Amino acid sequence: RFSEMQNERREQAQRTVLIHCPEKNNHFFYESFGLYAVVEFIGSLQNGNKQLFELLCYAESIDDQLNTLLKEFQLTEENTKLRYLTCSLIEDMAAAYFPDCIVRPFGSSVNTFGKLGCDLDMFLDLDNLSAHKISGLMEFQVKNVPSERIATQKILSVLGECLDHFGPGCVGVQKILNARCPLVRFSHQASGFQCALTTNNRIALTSSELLYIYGALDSRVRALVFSVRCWARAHWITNFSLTMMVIFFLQRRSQNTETLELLLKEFFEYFGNXXXXXXXXXXSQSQLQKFVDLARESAWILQQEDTDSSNRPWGLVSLLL
Amino acid sequence: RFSEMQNERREQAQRTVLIHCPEKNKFLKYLSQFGPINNHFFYESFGLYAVVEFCSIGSLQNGTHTXXXXXXXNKQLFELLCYAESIDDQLNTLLKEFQLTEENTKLRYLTCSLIEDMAAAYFPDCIVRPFGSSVNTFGKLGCDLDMFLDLDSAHKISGMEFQVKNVPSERIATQKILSVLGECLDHFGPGCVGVQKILNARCPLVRFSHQASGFQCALTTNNRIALTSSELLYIYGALDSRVRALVFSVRCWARAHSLTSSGAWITNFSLTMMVIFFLQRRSDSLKTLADAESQNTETLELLLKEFFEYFGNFXXXXXXXXXXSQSQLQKFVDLARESAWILQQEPWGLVSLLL
Numbered sequence: 001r002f003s004e005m006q007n008e009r010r011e012q013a014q015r016t017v018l019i020h021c022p023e024k025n026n027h028f029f030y031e032s033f034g035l036y037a038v039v040e041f042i043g044s045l046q047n048g049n050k051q052l053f054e055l056l057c058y059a060e061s062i063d064d065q066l067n068t069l070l071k072e073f074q075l076t077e078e079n080t081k082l083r084y085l086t087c088s089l090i091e092d093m094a095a096a097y098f099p100d101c102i103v104r105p106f107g108s109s110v111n112t113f114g115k116l117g118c119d120l121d122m123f124l125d126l127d128n129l130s131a132h133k134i135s136g137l138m139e140f141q142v143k144n145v146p147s148e149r150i151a152t153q154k155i156l157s158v159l160g161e162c163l164d165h166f167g168p169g170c171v172g173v174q175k176i177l178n179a180r181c182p183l184v185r186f187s188h189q190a191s192g193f194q195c196a197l198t199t200n201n202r203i204a205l206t207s208s209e210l211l212y213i214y215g216a217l218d219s220r221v222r223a224l225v226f227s228v229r230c231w232a233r234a235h236w237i238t239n240f241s242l243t244m245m246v247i248f249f250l251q252r253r254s255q256n257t258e259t260l261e262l263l264l265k266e267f268f269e270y271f272g273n274x275x276x277x278x279x280x281x282x283x284s285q286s287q288l289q290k291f292v293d294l295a296r297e298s299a300w301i302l303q304q305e306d307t308d309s310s311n312r313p314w315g316l317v318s319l320l321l
Numbered sequence: 322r323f324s325e326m327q328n329e330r331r332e333q334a335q336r337t338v339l340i341h342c343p344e345k346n347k348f349l350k351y352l353s354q355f356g357p358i359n360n361h362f363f364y365e366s367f368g369l370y371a372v373v374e375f376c377s378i379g380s381l382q383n384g385t386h387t388x389x390x391x392x393x394x395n396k397q398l399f400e401l402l403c404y405a406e407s408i409d410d411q412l413n414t415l416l417k418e419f420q421l422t423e424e425n426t427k428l429r430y431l432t433c434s435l436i437e438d439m440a441a442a443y444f445p446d447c448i449v450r451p452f453g454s455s456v457n458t459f460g461k462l463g464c465d466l467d468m469f470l471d472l473d474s475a476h477k478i479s480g481m482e483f484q485v486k487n488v489p490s491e492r493i494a495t496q497k498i499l500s501v502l503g504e505c506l507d508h509f510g511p512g513c514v515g516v517q518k519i520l521n522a523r524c525p526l527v528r529f530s531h532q533a534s535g536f537q538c539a540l541t542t543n544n545r546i547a548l549t550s551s552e553l554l555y556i557y558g559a560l561d562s563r564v565r566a567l568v569f570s571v572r573c574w575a576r577a578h579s580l581t582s583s584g585a586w587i588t589n590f591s592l593t594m595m596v597i598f599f600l601q602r603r604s605d606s607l608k609t610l611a612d613a614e615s616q617n618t619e620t621l622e623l624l625l626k627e628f629f630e631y632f633g634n635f636x637x638x639x640x641x642x643x644x645x646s647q648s649q650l651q652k653f654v655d656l657a658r659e660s661a662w663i664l665q666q667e668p669w670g671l672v673s674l675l676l
Contacts, residue, residue, distance in 0.1 A: 018476055020484065045478075089475055131438055132338045133338070134382075136343075141341065166485070167486070168485060169477060169484065
């Protein structure tokens, strides 16, 4: 149901078209520098933040708080289908050199812990060149592949070069072919997405299927991470570290009627006692402390909360200050 | 009949495939299994290759994994002229031995197709056609294959007009285009080695080398002027046998002495001109030819001799030469005046002049 979901979404973009305009199936358009229109049916045409804080104090429980913070931050169908199209425009540019190739989004854009206004990560799947120029047992004629890493750095370098000079929207391009997982980041003007592309690593689509299955395995999972992160930001250790500990904290429990209010509070209580590879299995001292500090403090606030409410700091909002 | 010829030749390479092989009819018996097969031919750059042209071709691509006559593509020429039976049979041998051969001609039209393939990724309906010394009729074997990429698009539209990167000057557009193509040839483009960008010359170009064929290639983008220079001469070389025969030999003559070289001298194109010139100032102007589209029995022997005699005094121009080193031009006439004498008297004929 994940591999499946992506394909209905990808096929979706293929019939979608992004149109720029002045200022005047289902159709939906958005804003940025002008008014852009997303339209889906072909070659038939070509041929011719803080306000959130204050909005929580009007909810009628801590549990209704997490659920608002999640609603306001999580991606929206529009946006979701808009970064799938972006992937499609790219996949178009890369399908010139590499015919049947797929660029599909991954990470925070596809699991369920995607926040609005984040990075669109893209993974270019290739399953080199195929010309008239053959070689003989007939076999296509390619440029000898020393390591599959260089082949990455190359590929990315050319796509990179193409995006930059002739490829609409694509700006702020920059190559980073030397970082363990070589990548190329640019920016698409028509959408405001910080995007990044990589080539050889089916590991990210496998990291993003996990969380997918967790975020959709139970409502509260999405609710709890979205708030811990937000808590965490409000005050190193990576957004992925936390998330883990949270799916973790969720297993080391256990049907389970617990409330977000209770669950949240038990989050901090539980962690009262570098690497996302050292202190947590691959699925700064001063820092981790200040985390438990926060953890232990963010505990007591909710302790009073229950032990001992209006439109001045309460429940969650007390924890985002 | 030029624009025309180029298209049949291009369509021709489209159905042509270039195969690399070890070193051994079982072989056509093979390829035959993907459809007929017009002609075909061998040749060997730094290995042995097959150039096969089918009668489509997608099916062969669907067939992959993960005692033979080679069709040839200098000094011995000197000695071979001394066995011809007249000075006129000399110019016509020197011309046959040096001029391009169907094989080669169709081999550099295929190379253009493999390139055109790499640039039709970015620019769909683009054509890369060869030009210059590879297309007129004055092309000598083993010369430069010059190519011209003619350009006449995403979902991402703008309002209904496509969305492009703003074109500052059409010269930068060129420089950019050539840079990407250039980047692509170098890294992932089979055979294409020794690549090098030259984007600052007045005609920006990118030169490389194709291993599979030994061609020194060169690509440029915006200039229909070369396809217009090359049609002129075309019509000249084909307008009368002797033209081809005469230039091929004055060039050779030229090269033989420290004259026409591969800097600041006098270019193989200069000469050629003077010769088409020399040929009109006898008993067809590029005017009554450019805008529009007489017998003369002279022999090559006579013609050639009168070439040097005519440039014995050559305060006058010659429509430097109009576009249709002092010490050097002199040593030219020196040679001109001497290379006359020799034919005046009684190694022989031409070969006397190539020494």
